[PDB]
Symmetry: C2
């Protein structure tokens, strides 16, 4: 509720520094990483 240009951008950036969806995507990939490491090590071990 204002007429000042640029207030919307600043206030939105302050309210939501990082969106939930991106945080959850990062979390999913990071949590799945160790299994990927184990599988790749297993592949390397054989042949």
């Amino acid at each position: 509720n204002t007429l000042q240009p640029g207030c919307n951008q600043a206030c939105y950036d302050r309210a939501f520094p990082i969106s939930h969806i991106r945080y959850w995507v990062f979390q999913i990939i990071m949590v799945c990483t160790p299994s990927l490491c184990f599988i790749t090590y297993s592949v390397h071990q054989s042949a």
Copy 2:
């Protein structure tokens, strides 16, 4: 600096309850009144 309807009216009314010009007009008439009283009394006294 706002988007709220009716904020301009309220804020202007609070800032300037009475305009200067109206106050000065009232002052001028009131200050001139006693001379009018005296002149009318003088007219009444004669004839």
